[PDB]
Design an enzyme around this catalytic site. Structure first.
Site, short mmCIF file in Angstrom:
data_model
loop_
_atom_site.label_atom_id
_atom_site.label_comp_id
_atom_site.label_asym_id
_atom_site.label_seq_id
_atom_site.Cartn_x
_atom_site.Cartn_y
_atom_site.Cartn_z
N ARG A 154 -3.24 40.63 17.80
CA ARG A 154 -2.17 41.32 17.09
C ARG A 154 -2.19 42.82 17.31
NH1 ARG A 154 -5.32 37.77 16.33
NH2 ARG A 154 -6.27 38.78 14.50
N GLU B 208 -0.94 32.28 13.45
CA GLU B 208 0.27 31.51 13.19
C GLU B 208 0.45 30.48 14.29
OE1 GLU B 208 0.47 34.81 14.08
OE2 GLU B 208 2.24 35.19 15.33
N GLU C 212 9.94 38.95 19.36
CA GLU C 212 9.20 39.99 18.66
C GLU C 212 8.06 40.54 19.52
OE1 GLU C 212 5.98 39.88 17.28
OE2 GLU C 212 5.49 37.86 18.00
N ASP D 44 15.47 45.78 24.44
CA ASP D 44 15.92 47.10 24.02
C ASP D 44 15.27 48.18 24.87
OD1 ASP D 44 16.88 49.32 22.62
OD2 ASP D 44 16.72 48.30 20.69
N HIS E 115 17.47 35.98 9.41
CA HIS E 115 16.38 35.49 10.26
C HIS E 115 16.50 36.19 11.61
CE1 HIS E 115 13.53 32.53 12.00
NE2 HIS E 115 13.16 32.38 10.75
N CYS F 170 14.38 36.35 13.96
CA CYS F 170 13.82 35.58 15.07
C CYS F 170 14.90 34.78 15.78
CB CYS F 170 12.71 34.67 14.56
SG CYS F 170 11.15 35.51 14.20
#
Lengths: 143, 692, 199
Positions: free
Chosen positions: B346, B379, B390, B447, B658, B660
């Site tokens: 992470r 997760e 993400e 982006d 949401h 995602c």
């Protein structure tokens, strides 16, 4: 042991002489299978007319069982002209052989009994980049 | 009665005498008979107007003093063309005699056939006869179109385009009848391609402004030089293919810098949005030569369709790789993971990507081109793209975050550039490349504010006047002003040859292009060498190593793919950055609804009206706040699949969408003032919350 | 003396060489090559060429000498002589001297050179790009010589070693040469392959 670029040997039977040998005293080592030469492997190498190039300076031969290992990878991936019309007759000055190419499946320049062997089937011919490959007698049936 | 059969070829004086005799006798029948006789055969036009060049320039003005000549012209041009087909299929007329390029010149110089009555059988059959022509005659004809004024070449390209539009409106296209099985439209497309090449030659094309491939000894794949072991020589690889006419003229689509007319004009939208590429790719790559692959015309197709073709190339690539690897595991018994599972931490994401992706790419660079199945630690679940999205956005933003010093920002144009004189590690600019290739191949918006220079020199180009005028056009304008400066630079500003060069700490470091750069005065007797040297050194030769690593990464994620010429430099941007145009009607007409609410609901109508109450800036800021990107996806707002779901009843508990899945789960509220206030607050606080 | 260069393999940076086509070992199929032992069995006075190619465009214009040197050393210094039966009989085209085995029919730019360096007329071979790019270069060479004419024939093989003379001081063109005219002209090659693979 042969680092000369312009003096590169091509054929193992051609290299058979200057290695101080008549027909049956060549002893070299392969690359892709990392083994000593085999008499049957020498016969098969002579049966496909390869061109020995030096690996990291040392010129080494090529085996027989490794035939369908680094060649099957490029028979279904890249594709181009796949016709027996003029698809390679005008884009270059000299059209082609009778039916000879530098083969990828049968892997010798032209097998004797391979002109109509594919034509008898008509199931997704592998004319890759315009090369009329065939099948050899060493890989006819499921082995 | 004179039949006028003693004369078989037409010239200025002879036609003038014929017209004078017709006027004196007040009978047009001899003229009609003569013109029909002349236009009934090819050789009559071959010998026609044989100079002992203004005849074609002036005679056609007086042809149109009547009306009965057009009826004869129509049937003459219907009848004549099949004779030309016979004389062009197998006759080798251009080979026998170069004096054969008069027939179509005469047939085409009359700027009056464009009436809709002709364009049913007259000009379509002329195009059918124009489809076949010896490959040198096409080029020779194109030279004169290229060396001509822009207005009339434009006029004929619209007449060809409106002929195309007329058929595509008339003719029907479906799966069983593609846009290629009709010969007339294909021939019109080929002639329009000829006009295309004429127009691109009209512009200031360039070939010296093409950076040479300073490729390092890239780790080769032994299956490439195995062929050299099979017995061949160093093959001119049957990889990148080139248009034959491009070879003839030595002109490539990339060579254009500033055209006479914008290249967007050639886009035939009525055909373009009725074209299918899923099987067009098969018609192209296998190169079946009884059909036309419209990708051979890289100008008649827009972003969406070309991107569909590129995605289909990636799909067939993955299909082939799986087909190979199933037998590879069957025989060799080696384990390979088809999914590019870049499972990282992470906070150590960058370095984990460095130590995994480069390792999986050195073994097989085609692994980068694959599909990635991101699975973090902590997760679990089936990753449909939200975790991947993400991952991508955090990677870009942290790289956009000046905590690494390798991505820089400028407020003049709001674009993100590399560090001009950094001392990075080559691995840093490899995950940008691989992630960019995935974004091009994951159908996901990334982006980023990359200018045209990135998408251009990433294609095999250098950058030029307009490419310089994308980041800092002020220096561009300053040198443009000096271009017409006829005074003495030495006696006015005595500035040395060098000017400056940016670095990390802002120090004006010493940098002379040549020896004694501070001791050579500026000479006004030549300026073009200044222009060339500037266009070289200020446009390249400064990010050679770092951008070389980046471009190496991009080329090793995509090297074997029809991407080098289908997409121009101005075209791959829309695949990742986003569509520049923001048309709301596209979003209206392309809308997908969920949550069990009917499309005819008044609540949805007033929500859309509330969105209408915003302006373009407010609309794009809302899109950035909700979707996460400030630009519409590929294909604009009229090609995506946006989802509207239900969060709950009328209550202000937790309005959340949401991100995602890019689903706008807007709560259903009755009063409009509360909706306006909440939406204004969301617009004001969009990215400051840190949620996205 | 008639010293001969060593039998090496000097192709060069740019690859121009022969390329041979195999169609089988039938009795009447002689337009072929020995894939293994690199041996030519093409019928005498018959048209049996198999395709032609070259890398891109080698610069032609200079003739390169090539002498048919023997293999066994007991007559390494021997001078090649045309068969007296063919020499006396009027079977050539008139331009061919009655002292050369060379019948230039696959090309047109080779001439007999009366080289007196070692009392051996070394005819030059055409150093030209064949068809400029294609597949399996095989320049058409057919010889009409019978080497059992009870004279200086002494049936034996002769190898056409290529010697390149040009502006540079290096002699190029060293490949796996092969020229034979005696014994069986064409026919099959499997039997000779089998009876030589045991030696």
């Amino acid at each position: 042991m042969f680092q000369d670029p312009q003096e590169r040997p091509r054929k193992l039977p051609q290299l058979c002489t200057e290695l101080q040998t008549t027909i049956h005293d060549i002893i070299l080592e392969c690359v892709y299978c990392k083994q000593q030469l085999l008499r049957r492997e020498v016969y098969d190498f002579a049966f496909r007319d390869l061109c020995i190039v030096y690996r990291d300076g040392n010129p080494y031969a090529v085996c027989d069982k490794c035939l369908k290992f680094y060649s099957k990878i490029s028979e279904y991936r890249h594709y181009c002209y796949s016709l027996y019309g003029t698809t390679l007759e005008q884009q270059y000055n000299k059209p082609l052989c009778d039916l000879l190419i530098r083969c990828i499946n049968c892997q010798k320049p032209l097998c004797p009994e391979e002109k109509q062997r594919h034509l008898d089937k008509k199931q997704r011919f592998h004319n890759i980049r315009g090369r009329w490959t065939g099948r050899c007698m060493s890989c006819c049936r499921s082995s | 009665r004179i039949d006028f059969k003693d004369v078989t070829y037409l010239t200025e004086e002879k036609v003038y005498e014929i017209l004078e005799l017709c006027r004196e006798r007040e009978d047009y029948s001899p003229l009609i008979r003569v013109i029909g006789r002349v236009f009934s055969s090819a050789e009559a036009l071959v010998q026609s107007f044989r100079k002992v060049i203004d005849a074609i320039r002036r005679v056609y003005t007086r042809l149109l003093s009547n009306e009965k000549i057009e009826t004869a012209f129509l049937n003459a041009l219907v009848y004549l063309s099949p004779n030309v087909e016979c004389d062009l299929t197998y006759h080798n007329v251009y080979s026998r005699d170069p004096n054969y390029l008069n027939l179509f010149i005469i047939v085409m110089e009359n700027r009056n056939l464009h009436s809709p009555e002709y364009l049913e059988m007259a000009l379509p059959l002329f195009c059918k006869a124009m489809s076949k022509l010896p490959l040198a005659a096409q080029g020779k004809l194109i030279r004169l179109w290229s060396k001509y004024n822009a207005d009339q070449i434009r006029r004929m390209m619209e007449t060809f385009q409106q002929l195309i539009t007329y058929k595509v409106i008339s003719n029907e296209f479906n799966s069983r009848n593609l846009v290629n099985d009709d010969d007339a439209i294909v021939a019109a497309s080929k002639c329009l391609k000829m006009v295309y090449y004429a127009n691109v030659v009209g512009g200031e094309v360039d070939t010296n402004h093409n950076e040479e491939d300073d490729e390092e000894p890239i780790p080769e794949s032994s299956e490439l030089t195995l062929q050299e072991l099979l017995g061949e020589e160093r093959r001119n690889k049957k990889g990148p293919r080139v248009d034959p006419l491009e070879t003839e003229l030595g002109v490539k689509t990339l060579d254009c810098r500033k055209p006479l007319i914008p290249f967007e004009e050639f886009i035939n939208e009525p055909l373009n949005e009725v074209l299918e590429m899923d099987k067009d790719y098969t018609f192209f790559k296998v190169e079946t030569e009884n059909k036309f692959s419209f990708m051979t015309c890289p100008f008649i197709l827009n972003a969406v369709t070309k991107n569909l073709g590129l995605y289909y190339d990636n799909r067939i690539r993955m299909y082939s790789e799986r087909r190979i690897t199933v037998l590879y595991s069957l025989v060799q018994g080696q384990q390979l993971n088809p999914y590019l599972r870049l499972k990282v931490r992470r906070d150590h994401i960058i370095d984990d990507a460095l130590v995994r992706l480069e390792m999986i790419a050195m073994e097989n660079p085609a692994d980068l081109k694959k599909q990635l199945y991101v699975e973090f630690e902590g997760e679990q679940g089936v990753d449909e793209g939200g975790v991947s999205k993400e991952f991508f956005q955090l990677v870009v933003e942290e790289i956009f975050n000046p905590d690494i010093g390798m991505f820089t920002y400028d407020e003049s144009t709001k674009l993100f550039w590399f560090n001009p004189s950094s001392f990075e590690t080559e691995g840093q600019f490899t995950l940008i490349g691989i992630v960019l290739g995935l974004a091009i191949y994951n159908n996901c918006i990334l982006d980023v504010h990359f200018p045209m220079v990135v998408y251009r020199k990433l294609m095999g180009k250098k950058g030029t006047f307009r490419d310089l005028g994308d980041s800092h056009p002020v220096l561009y304008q300053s040198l443009k002003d000096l271009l017409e400066y006829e005074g003495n630079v030495e006696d006015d500003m005595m500035i040395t040859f060098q000017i400056s060069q940016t670095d990390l700490f802002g120090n004006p470091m010493m940098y002379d292009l040549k020896e004694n750069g501070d001791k050579i005065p500026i000479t006004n007797e030549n300026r073009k060498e200044f222009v060339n040297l500037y266009s070289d050194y200020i446009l390249n030769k400064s990010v050679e190593k770092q951008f070389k690593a980046f471009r190496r990464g991009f080329h090793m994620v995509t090297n074997e793919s029809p991407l080098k010429y289908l997409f121009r430099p101005e075209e791959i941007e829309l695949l990742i950055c986003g569509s520049r145009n923001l048309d709301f009607q596209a979003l209206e007409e392309t809308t997908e609804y969920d949550g069990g609410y009917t499309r005819d609901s008044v609540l949805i109508r007033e929500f859309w009206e509330i969105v209408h109450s915003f302006t373009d800036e407010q609309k794009r800021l809302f899109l950035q706040f909700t979707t996460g990107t400030d630009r519409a996806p590929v294909g604009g707002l009229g090609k995506l699949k946006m989802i509207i779901a239900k969060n709950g009843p009328d209550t202000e508990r937790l309005p959340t969408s949401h991100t995602c899945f890019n689903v706008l789960l807007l709560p259903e509220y009755s009063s409009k003032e509360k909706l306006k206030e909440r939406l204004l607050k969301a617009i004001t606080y969009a990215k400051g919350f840190g949620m996205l | 003396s008639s010293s001969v260069p060593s039998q090496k393999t000097y192709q060069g940076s740019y690859g121009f060489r022969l390329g041979f086509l195999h169609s089988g070992t039938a009795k009447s199929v002689t337009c072929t090559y020995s894939p293994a032992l690199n041996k030519l069995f093409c019928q005498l006075a018959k048209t049996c060429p198999v395709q032609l190619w070259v890398d891109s465009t080698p610069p032609p214009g200079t003739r390169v000498r090539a002498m048919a040197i023997y293999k066994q050393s007991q007559h390494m210094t021997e001078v090649v002589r045309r068969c007296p039966h063919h020499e006396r009989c009027s079977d050539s085209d008139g331009l061919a001297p009655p002292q050369h085995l060379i019948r230039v029919e696959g090309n047109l730019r080779a001439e007999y050179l009366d080289d007196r360096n070692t009392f051996r007329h070394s005819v030059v071979v055409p150093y030209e790009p064949p068809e400029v790019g294609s597949d399996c270069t095989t320049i058409h060479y057919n010889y009409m010589c019978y080497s059992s004419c009870m004279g200086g024939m002494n049936r034996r093989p002769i190898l056409t070693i290529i010697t390149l003379e040009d502006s540079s001081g290096n002699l190029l063109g060293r490949d796996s040469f092969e020229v034979r005219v005696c014994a069986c002209p064409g026919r099959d090659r499997r039997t000779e392959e089998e009876n030589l693979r045991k030696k």
